[PDB]
Amino acid sequence: GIQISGKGFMPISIIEGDQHIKVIAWLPGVNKEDIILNAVGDTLEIRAKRSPLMITESERIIYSEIPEEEEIYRTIKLPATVKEENASAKFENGVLSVILPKAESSIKKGINIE
Amino acid sequence: GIQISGKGFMPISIIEGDQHIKVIAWLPGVNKEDIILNAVGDTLEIRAKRSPLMITESERIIYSEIPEEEEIYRTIKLPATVKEENASAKFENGVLSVILPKAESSIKKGINIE
Amino acid sequence: IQISGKGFMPISIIEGDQHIKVIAWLPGVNKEDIILNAVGDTLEIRAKRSPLMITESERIIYSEIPEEEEIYRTIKLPATVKEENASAKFENGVLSVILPKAESSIKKGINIE
Amino acid sequence: GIQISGKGFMPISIIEGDQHIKVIAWLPGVNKEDIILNAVGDTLEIRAKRSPLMITESERIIYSEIPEEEEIYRTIKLPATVKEENASAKFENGVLSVILPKAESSIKKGINIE
Amino acid sequence: GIQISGKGFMPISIIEGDQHIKVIAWLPGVNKEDIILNAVGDTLEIRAKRSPLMITESERIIYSEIPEEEEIYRTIKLPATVKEENASAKFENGVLSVILPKAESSIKKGINIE
Amino acid sequence: GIQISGKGFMPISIIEGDQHIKVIAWLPGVNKEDIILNAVGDTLEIRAKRSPLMITESERIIYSEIPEEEEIYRTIKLPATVKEENASAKFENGVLSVILPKAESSIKKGINIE
Amino acid sequence: IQISGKGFMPISIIEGDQHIKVIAWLPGVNKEDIILNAVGDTLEIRAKRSPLMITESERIIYSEIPEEEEIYRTIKLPATVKEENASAKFENGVLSVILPKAESSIKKGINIE
Amino acid sequence: GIQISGKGFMPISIIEGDQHIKVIAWLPGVNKEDIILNAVGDTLEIRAKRSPLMITESERIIYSEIPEEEEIYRTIKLPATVKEENASAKFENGVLSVILPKAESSIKKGINIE
Amino acid sequence: GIQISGKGFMPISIIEGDQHIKVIAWLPGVNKEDIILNAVGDTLEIRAKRSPLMITESERIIYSEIPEEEEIYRTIKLPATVKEENASAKFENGVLSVILPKAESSIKKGINIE
Amino acid sequence: GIQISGKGFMPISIIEGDQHIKVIAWLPGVNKEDIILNAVGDTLEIRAKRSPLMITESERIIYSEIPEEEEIYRTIKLPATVKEENASAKFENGVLSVILPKAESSIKKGINIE
Amino acid sequence: GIQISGKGFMPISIIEGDQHIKVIAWLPGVNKEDIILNAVGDTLEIRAKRSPLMITESERIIYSEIPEEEEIYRTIKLPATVKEENASAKFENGVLSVILPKAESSIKKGINIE
Amino acid sequence: GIQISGKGFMPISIIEGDQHIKVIAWLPGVNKEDIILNAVGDTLEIRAKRSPLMITESERIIYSEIPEEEEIYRTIKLPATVKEENASAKFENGVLSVILPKAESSIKKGINIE
Amino acid sequence: GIQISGKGFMPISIIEGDQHIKVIAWLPGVNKEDIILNAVGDTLEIRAKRSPLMITESERIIYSEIPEEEEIYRTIKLPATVKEENASAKFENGVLSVILPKAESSIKKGINIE
Amino acid sequence: GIQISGKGFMPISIIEGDQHIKVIAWLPGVNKEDIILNAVGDTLEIRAKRSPLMITESERIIYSEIPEEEEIYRTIKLPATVKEENASAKFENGVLSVILPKAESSIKKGINIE
Amino acid sequence: GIQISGKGFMPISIIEGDQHIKVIAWLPGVNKEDIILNAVGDTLEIRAKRSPLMITESERIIYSEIPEEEEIYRTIKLPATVKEENASAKFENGVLSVILPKAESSIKKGINIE
Amino acid sequence: GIQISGKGFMPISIIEGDQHIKVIAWLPGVNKEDIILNAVGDTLEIRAKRSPLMITESERIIYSEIPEEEEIYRTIKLPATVKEENASAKFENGVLSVILPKAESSIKKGINIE
Amino acid sequence: IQISGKGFMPISIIEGDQHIKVIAWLPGVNKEDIILNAVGDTLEIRAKRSPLMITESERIIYSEIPEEEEIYRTIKLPATVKEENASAKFENGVLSVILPKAESSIKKGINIE
């Protein structure tokens, strides 16, 4: 039970362990400082500014596969409530990766097969 | 992650801040005192009655783009739990605006990108 | 009986024997931002409505509300009118104009014998 | 430039002589005194009430091809301006007939084929 | 179990009481004397002549919603056998109304709910 | 309220008077004596046999719009019960005509429009 | 082998070695209301059939029977014929014409050796 | 030969024995005294009003699979003529049940297979 | 002139003579004693049970064109009223054949073509 | 704000006031003692058995609009948590009506429009 | 491996035991002595004429769900070779039933599940 | 202007020399003496009987791609008039071959290209 | 269970007796000597050469319904194994006919109906 | 409220009592020790590998209705929160069965119908 | 080279080596003793009963992907004749695996590529 | 009457003589020793493995019409039983050719056309 | 990167830094029946493959095998090449050509600072 929603290209992946959740996000062309990242309960929010390709007035864009929007964001409802305060994150090479330990109440417990 | 539902034409907008939600509602031709408004948890209700164009018996309606219903309403499920008791509201020029501070358990905490 | 112009603005048009009422929805517009003129059989309504103002902390996460700031309507009525005696009031987002008909446009009875 | 418009079943025909226009209108079930008829210039208006089939509480309508609306009307733009003040009209057998003499400015004059 | 059939515009309605049947018929533009009306058992027949709009040779029909046919008729099979001989009828304002008391064998009798 | 049914091409017409029914039937190429015809109540039957074009063995049919069947028949349910015993009939030029006086219980009585 | 004209009139066309028979349905027509001529390879049939006559007491409540009073057919045959020796009989609504073939149109044997 | 017809949701079932017809009818929400039930020959009529769900002005209908109409009725033509005067009926728990003994003339008599 | 209706596969044919109707019914795999057969007026009823193919628990049905229903029936409305009391019937080889003499009132009488 | 789900025909309506929810259920032909009714939190369960129309072996069902299932049920999720212990319910005339007072935590509080 | 093929309506069913095949066949209207039945290897043939419904020249077929063909036949390839010489057969009530013991080489031998 | 017409499967080919026309025709299964062949002007006629495959009452036709018609014929309009009296024809191996010398009036003469 | 396959127009028929199989083949325009014919078990092979219409260089083919292929053949799998060595064949008039007595193992044996 | 989701063929069934949920799951080809099973709140997870059909290099798979994937899993959101720590489970014959007692807060309490 | 056929869900795979065929069958929820397994020539038969999920009358099936049939079977025709007597079989974990050594006459012998 | 089946691109041709079958197979890029080939009865098998285009890590495939699979195979059911032990085979230039003499029981014997 | 010509002949095209390999399926063709030339950026392959030879006793009863005897391909490559140092081998129905790139077509590095 997960829902993404927001504006602008931003490919997400979601990885679930027994005791945590990893979220991965593509943000090519974004500055680490331009990225806000907050969470609580079962929701994670990612906000990003990417400034546009700056062209001198000599230059023209004669071809482009690259999205224009400068404001981009995603709100992600995850399969488990998490501990925001132990959440880590790094940002290398256009890729954001967030680690979100699960709250105890959301950690599943085994059932033996007899 | 939002749900609107009820009877009547009533264009809604929803604005999220870090610590509040604003809801805006179009209600042309309604009287401030004919509006009821309550909330709790993560749900807002707006009720309204707008009386119909009153024609003398000499006059006929020869053309109307204007909805007829006299009972109108909306129930709105917001993306955060709120503090009803600090909610304020205004009604100017056919437009209702409601401010609803977020409850502390719904306020999101930062994660640092190291 | 032709409407035409830019922007969301629900009109209704009422006819009496001696006048035309025109009603218009203009939620979110300020009385002083509305221009209103007329002559012969045509009525013009122009309005500006400024956009919902957001602090830089806030985002719009959902909107059914039109964005255009310039809105107008030209309305050709089923009778010539007297502009000079035309009245108008603006309550609660609703504009109502009253437009007495010109004498030349007032219909006279025929008897069914 | 013959434009009919209004509400209600009401079949009109329109007959043009050199010096007049005849409008014929079906209004079965209407009382002569419940009919308003006015004109000016090149427009004719016909307004009528027809009260509904009267049923005692014993009776039921088990079949009907007969329109139910009580308010019925028509505005008709003619192909010539007329002299309202000389217009006549009878109402026999559910049929209204209106005679509308043409204004002089609207009476066509001949061209000789030499 | 009712069947209309015949030629020409003639909107019928049918009303049923415990002890009778009313039939209503629109016949704008028809002369009372031009209408034959007979019945037996469970069938009613209505025959009508309406003569055409008569135009002088100056005049032209430049527009018409009004049916042309001069012979019009309807045969109506009703939900009950009736007493023709006690049948009444009046014709006002383009509308024929026929009253047709039910035969005794066709009058339903109540059933008590215990 | 009519039903035809049976085998073969046989164009039927039906004429109603106040006191009779006439039925007309096309039967090209049939012999008056090869026709059976009976009635009772409100049903007429027509039976007929038409022998086929007889070709010598030198001759071939190189084109035919003409039905082939030799047995042909029709059962016709009329809108009134009849007196069989006063029924007459004629057969001229491929056309059969039958006159069938109505029984007294099927003859319709007038209603006066007051 | 072309048919053409106005009105319901089922034709059949039979060929012998030495003649053409033409058959035609004309129910409700009077022998004397039928004109019949021919030449070379063409046959014409014209007929009038008067309408079903109704007293003013009677109504037609159902009809599968064509209404046209003028009916005709022009038929181009697969051989030239001798008009002058053409015969014809009219029984029971059915017209039958016999049309001997012209000599120039009679086919001669070829032997299969 | 089995025709239903009239206004309103009202699921009928029909049951034939050798010597009677049973009609069953769903009429949830209806009052025993609000039901009229009469019959003659081979027809049964059922009439019933059901008053609408009543709401205080605090309350709103937020959802509803339940038809709204208040006047509801059924005319039923049965496969047999019956004896009205011996017809009984019960109304328990939303369900009307009607027992209609067949008339003698309508009771089928056996044929032996030899 | 005919209506069949009921449950089950059971091909009927219907034969009309001057003085009787013959009904024929396919009923393969039914037992002569399992057949009930009654009639009155213009309606015949055939009822039949056929028991299912009997399999031992060793055996499986590996292919089957043969209907499964065990209750089968037809109610037939004929083109004439009949004399039930003089009706005979035979059951050979899966085929039921019923002979139903017409009642006098339903026998057609000749009309002479002069 | 609502989800219904389960097996069987069983029209529900749902009414919301300020302080309670009313659920209404069509259940014609069910017995008050055959109805089980429980609730907790924001979910109501209705279970019901209705036994089938009872036919003697003389009798056949010749026509039926009436569902056959005998096990019927609904699980309903309401727009508010409720107080199960103060819930009442009535079963008249095939109609079940349940009253479910809202829990305090689910009651909405007013906001003033200044 | 199960192929039917031939002329005429003839509903087959096929039944397998461990040690035989049963073929069942519908042949209503057929005479025991008009049926030929032979077999070898894994094929069975069934041939049968049924003479047509016989009508006096007074009588007409007015209706008929019953196939007309007189020659009817079935070739059936079975899932097993059989012993023709021990095959039996009965013909009661329209139904042919054939019992075909399997040949030894075709009888399956068990495998134990260890 | 090459027109073929008649009944029956009979493939024709047509070959044109300077001074003749060859017609070839398939007629497998036909006896040379059952073929009639005549011509005049620009038309050739071919008539043939082929009697059907002869089956003893032991045998059955279990498959067939071979046309059944016994009467077969063709009329052929050629692109030139011919001299019937000098026409020859053989019939070998189911194939008829006809040689038809061209009439002098139909023999083309050369044009020199200068 | 029969399969044809091969190249070129060659209409086949297949006739089956109790003790043999007849195959018939159309081969207009083929020389008896140009036809090879072999068989074994349950398959028959037919090979044929037909040489093309030979045209002098004066002549043109201006129209043709006649297949061109010179090599034609069919392999036919029959419903029974046969005795090749007792197989006869004749070839008259473009038609090949082959007689193929059945092998004893393929001759079916009767089953008595008791 | 009942959501399945994940990789692989694995037919689930879900069973509710008053005081528990039973989950059943098909897992043919899987080893008891290759199955992981955990739960908390209202979610159950099932994970399982099944190794693939093993073929020697002589052998080939010539046909296969059997899915190939080796990793298979199911996340299931149930209609009730449960008590993980008392959940049991058996795995016989391809079938996993899990018993999940409901938590007290989720057990529905009865309402009396007065 | 293969035909499966029978009743029920039961995924088969088929493995061919040089000297045997392996058949694999999904049969989750079946009991080893409820499985019958025979073979001969080139055909294998698997028969199985599986009893239905057992519910107490407290419990309801609220969701189910799991087939219901209790009788399930497959008849399989293999690409080789086999030695039934040396066939083995195992049933673990819902999976049946049968090993079927090829008969000598069905074992392929090498051909050398020179 | 032929069946091919297996994995991979491998264009097959089949040539029949009176006394043999030749099979030709395209196998570009396969090594003579990587080909297995066996036969018996009326079935031929061809197995082959072709290793993939081997690219150094500087090189990329920028375009390929060439199938990728490394395992390829074909099983071929021929129209005659063969003598495996006299089968020969060749493999030149990517093309395999196999000669397979027919067994004596599959060699067809002549029929004389008398 | 354009292919064009007559006949079934699956090509693949491999690029290195310094050369282009071209592979081509030509089952049933004789090494000596293959012509192979090139220049600048274009490669041509022509081949004849003679048809499956049948004795007059034998018939082809089924064939998935193309019949055309003339087959060819013209291939325009993504670089100009050195024809003179082009090699080529033909094993097992498969033709493989190696075509070193011309100097003017060899790409040079750019550094990412």
| D76, D44 contact by CB (below 8 A) | yes
Give the distance from residue J63's alpha carbon to the nearest chain B alpha carbon, in angstroms.
Answer: 40
Q: How far apart are CA F93 and CA F80, in angstroms?
A: 28
Considering only CB atoms, which chain A residues are within 8 Å of B106? 40-41
| I10, I27 contact by CB (below 8 A) | yes
Measuring CA to CA, which residue among J83, J107, J100, J80 is closest to residue J23? J100
Does the distance separating the beta carbons of M89 and P1 come in below 8 Å? no
Q: Which of E3, E21, E113, E114 to mutate to test the interface with H (most CBs of H within 10 A)?
A: E113
Angle at C113 between CA C107 and CA D3, to 5 degrees: 40
Q: In what order do the strands lie in the sheet with D88-92?
A: D88-92, D95-101, D20-26, D12-16, E60-64
Chains meeting G at 3+ CB pairs closer than 8 A? F, L
Q: Which two tokens stand for residue M99?
A: 């007689």
Among Q21, Q29, Q92, beta carbon nearest to P29: Q92
| G21, F59 contact by CB (below 8 A) | yes
| L82, L39 contact by CB (below 8 A) | yes
Q: According to the 3-state scheme, what is the secondary structure of O37-75? A: EEEECCEEEEEEECCCCCCCCCCEEEEECCCCCCEEEEE
* Helix/strand/coil for P33: helix
Q: How far apart are CA M78 and CA M87, in angstroms?
A: 14
Measuring CA to CA, which residue among G1, G2, G11, G19 is closest to residue G71? G11
| Chain J contacts to B (CB-CB under 8 A) | 1, 79, 105-114
Considering only CB atoms, which chain J residues are within 8 Å of N2? 5
| Chain Q contacts to P (CB-CB under 8 A) | 1, 10-18, 21, 23, 25-30, 52, 54-55, 57-66, 78, 92-94
Considering only CB atoms, which chain H residues are within 8 Å of J79? 62
Q: Is the dihedral of CA C56, C58, C59, C62 positive or negative?
A: negative
Does the distance separating the beta carbons of K38 and M110 come in below 8 Å? yes
Angle at N53 between CA N47 and CA N58, to 5 degrees: 160
Considering only CB atoms, which chain D residues are within 8 Å of E65? 11-13
CA gyration radius, chain P? 18
Q: How far apart are CA N105 and CA N85, in angstroms?
A: 16
Residue F62: which region, alpha, beta or left (left: phi > 0; alpha: psi -120 to 50)? alpha
Task: Report the 10 Å Cβ neighbour count for C108.
Answer: 10
Q: What residue type is assigned to position I95 of the chain? A: V
Considering only CB atoms, which chain F residues are within 8 Å of I110? 36-38
Chains meeting F at 3+ CB pairs closer than 8 A? E, G, I
Give the distance from residue J113's alpha carbon to the nearest chain B alpha carbon, in angstroms.
Answer: 5
Does the distance separating the beta carbons of B37 and J109 come in below 8 Å? no
Give the distance from residue E86's alpha carbon to the nearest chain H alpha carbon, in angstroms.
Answer: 22
Does the distance separating the beta carbons of J113 and B35 come in below 8 Å? yes
* Helix/strand/coil for I111: coil
| E27, F96 contact by CB (below 8 A) | no
Largest CA distance in chain I: 76
Does the distance separating the beta carbons of C94 and B95 come in below 8 Å? no
Residues paired with residue N38 on neighbouring β-strands, in sequence order: A110, N45
* Helix/strand/coil for Q31: helix
Evaluate whether the domain defined by G1-113 bears CATH number 2.60.40.790. Answer: yes
Does the distance separating the beta carbons of J1 and B90 come in below 8 Å? no
Give the distance from residue Q28's alpha carbon to the nearest chain P alpha carbon, in angstroms.
Answer: 5
Closest chain C residue by Cα to residue B32: C92
Give the distance from residue I36's alpha carbon to the nearest chain F alpha carbon, in angstroms.
Answer: 31
Considering only CB atoms, which chain B residues are within 8 Å of A89? 111-114
Residues paired with residue P40 on neighbouring β-strands, in sequence order: P43
Residues paired with residue C48 on neighbouring β-strands, in sequence order: C70
Q: Which of F31, F38, F73, F91 to mutate to test the interface with I (most CBs of I within 10 A)?
A: F38
The fold of the I1-114 domain, in CATH, is Immunoglobulin-like (2.60.40)
Does the distance separating the beta carbons of C106 and D98 come in below 8 Å? no
Does the distance separating the beta carbons of I105 and F38 come in below 8 Å? no
Considering only CB atoms, which chain F residues are within 8 Å of E96? 113
Closest chain G residue by Cα to residue L91: G112
On the CB side of B9, CA atoms within 13 Å amount to: 16
Measured between alpha carbons, how far is residue F64 from residues G3, L8, L9 in Å? 11, 17, 20
Determination technique for this PDB entry?
X-ray
| L99, M50 contact by CB (below 8 A) | no
Chains meeting J at 3+ CB pairs closer than 8 A? B, H, N
**Residue written as token pair 């062949």:** L37
Q: What is the resolution of this structure in A?
A: 2.8
The bridge status of strand P88-92 relative to strand A20-26 is unpaired
Residue L42: which region, alpha, beta or left (left: phi > 0; alpha: psi -120 to 50)? alpha
Q: Which of H81, H108, H109, H114 to mutate to test the interface with I (most CBs of I within 10 A)?
A: H108
Q: How far apart are CA P100 and CA P46, in angstroms?
A: 13
Q: Which of H2, H22, H55, H95 to mutate to test the interface with J (most CBs of J within 10 A)?
A: H95
Q: How far apart are CA Q22 and CA Q94, in angstroms?
A: 11
Among L56, L62, L94, beta carbon nearest to M29: L94
Give the distance from residue D52's alpha carbon to the nearest chain C alpha carbon, in angstroms.
Answer: 23
Task: Report the 10 Å Cβ neighbour count for C9.
Answer: 21
Measured between alpha carbons, how far is residue K87 from residues F84, K24, K48, M111 in Å? 64, 13, 19, 6
Q: How far apart are CA A18 and CA B37, in angstroms?
A: 44
Considering only CB atoms, which chain N residues are within 8 Å of O56? 17
| Chain E contacts to F (CB-CB under 8 A) | 3, 5, 32, 35-41, 43, 45, 75, 77, 84-85, 87-91, 96, 98
| N24, N89 contact by CB (below 8 A) | no
Q: How far apart are CA O63 and CA F75, in angstroms?
A: 59
Chains meeting B at 3+ CB pairs closer than 8 A? A, C, J
Q: How far apart are CA B26 and CA C25, in angstroms?
A: 10
Q: How far apart are CA H56 and CA J99, in angstroms?
A: 14
Does the distance separating the beta carbons of H14 and J64 come in below 8 Å? yes
Q: What residue type is assigned to position O41 of the chain? A: G
Considering only CB atoms, which chain G residues are within 8 Å of F69? none
Among A105, A110, A114, beta carbon nearest to N38: A110
Does the distance separating the beta carbons of E62 and D15 come in below 8 Å? yes
Considering only CB atoms, which chain O residues are within 8 Å of N53? 13, 15, 24
Residues 6+ apart with CB under 8 A from C112: D32, D35, D37, D89, D90, D91, D96
Measured between alpha carbons, how far is residue E39 from residues B5, E84, K21 in Å? 58, 6, 71
Q: How far apart are CA A34 and CA A29, in angstroms?
A: 10
Among B14, B55, B56, beta carbon nearest to C62: B14
Considering only CB atoms, which chain H residues are within 8 Å of I47? none
Buried b vs exposed e over M4-24: b needs ≥16 C-beta within 10 Å? eebeebbbbbbbbbeebbbbb
| L12, L37 contact by CB (below 8 A) | no
| Chain D contacts to C (CB-CB under 8 A) | 32, 35-41, 43, 45, 75, 84-85, 87-91, 96, 98
Q: How far apart are CA H105 and CA H42, in angstroms?
A: 12
Does the distance separating the beta carbons of M108 and K39 come in below 8 Å? yes
Task: Report the 10 Å Cβ neighbour count for P70.
Answer: 12
* Residue-by-residue DSSP string for chain L: --EEE-SS---EEEEE-SSEEEEEEE-TT--GGGEEEEEETTEEEEEEE-PPP---TT-EEEEE-S---SEEEEEEE-SS-B-GGG-EEEEETTEEEEEEEBPGGG--------
Among L15, L66, L95, beta carbon nearest to M13: L66
Considering only CB atoms, which chain H residues are within 8 Å of E107? 40
